[PDB]
Design an enzyme around this catalytic site. Sequence first.
Site, PDB file in Angstrom:
ATOM      1  CD  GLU A  84      -3.893  26.288  20.581  1.00 43.37           C
ATOM      2  OE1 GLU A  84      -2.713  26.357  20.971  1.00 43.37           O
ATOM      3  OE2 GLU A  84      -4.709  25.470  21.061  1.00 43.37           O
TER       4      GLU A  84
ATOM      5  CG  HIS B  98       0.021  25.766  22.697  1.00 46.73           C
ATOM      6  ND1 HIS B  98      -0.912  24.784  22.438  1.00 46.73           N
ATOM      7  CD2 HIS B  98       1.180  25.123  22.966  1.00 46.73           C
ATOM      8  CE1 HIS B  98      -0.336  23.600  22.540  1.00 46.73           C
ATOM      9  NE2 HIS B  98       0.933  23.777  22.866  1.00 46.73           N
TER      10      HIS B  98
ATOM     11  CB  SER C  47       1.335  20.548  23.474  1.00 41.88           C
ATOM     12  OG  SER C  47       2.261  20.989  22.497  1.00 41.88           O
TER      13      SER C  47
END
Length: 566
Positions: free
Chosen positions: A347, A467, A214
Amino acid sequence: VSLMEKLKWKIKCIENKFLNYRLTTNETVVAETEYGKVKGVKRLTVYDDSYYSFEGIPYAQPPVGELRFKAPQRPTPWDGVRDCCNHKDKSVQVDFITGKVCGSEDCLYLSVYTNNLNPETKRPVLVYIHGGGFIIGENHRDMYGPDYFIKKDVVLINIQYRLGALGFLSLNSEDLNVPGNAGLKDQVMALRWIKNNCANFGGNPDNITVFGESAGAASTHYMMLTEQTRGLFHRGILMSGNAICPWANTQCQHRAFTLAKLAGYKGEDNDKDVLEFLMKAKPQDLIKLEEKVLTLEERTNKVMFPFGPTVEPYQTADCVLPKHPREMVKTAWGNSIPTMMGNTSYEGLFFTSILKQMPLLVKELETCVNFVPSELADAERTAPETLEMGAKIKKAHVTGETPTADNFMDLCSHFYFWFPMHRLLQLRFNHTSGTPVYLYRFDFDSEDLINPYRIMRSGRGVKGVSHTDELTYFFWNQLAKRMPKESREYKTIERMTGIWTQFATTGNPYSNEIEGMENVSWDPIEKSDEVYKCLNISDELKMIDVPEMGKIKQWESMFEKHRDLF
């Protein structure tokens, strides 16, 4: 976050502290650094392995007082033995569980781990940079435990860096020496330390891998882009992020004033007077108020964070981002080192929580004008060209008459992750020596082993690989438990840590010594590829064409008349 997860987390915090005491040994050891001797301690894992643990190694001066918002300076060396048997505090930040501010300005430390202090050969060095939108995160072992990686013969290193406004305040006036990107300059100085000191821990200074997820991915990419780090490491892994993601940079030079005003500043909008107030404000007041800085227009234009990496207004000694990331890729030394990149299979599922508070966001997909890349869209998002681009996006993700939350979460995957990755690969191809980039797709779904981010995204009992779902298979955290060794979860830990250490070692992720990889032909991406091929990681490992490819080309078609900006 709920009252239940507050009391529940409180208990796991108390449990982790007792477990951590239990998993500690009496075996202290001393190692050399270029700043002096440090004392570490051997610790145990729940799988009955052990490792040497050096925590709280400073790699820069405490950035308090007059160093606040400033580039980091080297720390003061010491005689004798520095105690490194306990963690230091995290960067000042809002606790996502409680909502209270925690941390301290004294945060610039790194941690070093390895199963063997005196290997018979120099080991691969792996450097993890945590994510957390540059506003939260830490290198504490209740969140990023080395327990899985030390099963391998590597040196693992977890760094910290300044978060939020303390990490990324940016002021136009050249006299005040606050160009911005202080937190990135932290990361640089930590890399310089790792380069000069890993050998003292059994590491190979000529075989260093930097990776992160990230915001940690964007950090990693930035470390590959800036001249400041040239030649410092040799492999990169970008997990769900890079520096041309729309959330990974922002021009925030006008937002210092706003922040000051929220914190009680009385006076005019000039940088000098703004800086002086911010320099003397309580650190936890600045951090608690960051959430209020963004205007409603900015939130409308999908600006996610008020402070973050930014094109620096002027160049100084430790400048990191002198130009927009797209321009830096054209010269980046990191283009010529082996790179791995990847995303999870769903995601945007991360945004379940946000939608639960703002169901009105789903209506944005009626035209999708808000998700048009900002460089292409107009201010009010009302120009007919913008409505046209919005339509192309809409065709990609709205499956029926009315948009749904699934459509919304599917769009986010591409807006925040898949589209930026595509743009970066195409840009890199035109400016690279031809070093391989490998792609993966993390598709392994499990509820039987989780990590704290699942509490924040409200991922409790939610199918799909969100995610940050992959972190669980890389690091130990205080929500983990020992898994049977024949379990699907345990196999994935072995595969995941297997591939990462294999890549770190050789710049090539394939190994037949990894279970499941016997039929795998993992080829890197060529410039002439119209379709990306990636290692799909689920219960089985399988090479496939990236399923997100058609939707990715749809997003690319928004740039049909503006190919210079692609």
